[PDB]
């Protein structure tokens, strides 16, 4: 597992962030 560059998804509105998986 690691966290890198990504795009969130709050209220069907993608918003640049970090995602871990």
UniProtKB/Swiss-Prot annotation:
Domain of life: Eukaryota
Chain segments annotated as transmembrane: none
Cystine connections: 3-20
Function: Has antimicrobial activity against the Gram-negative bacteria E.coli and P.mirabilis, the Gram-positive bacterium L.monocytogenes and the yeast C.albicans.
Protein name, UniProt field: Arenicin-1
Organism in which the protein naturally occurs: Arenicola marina
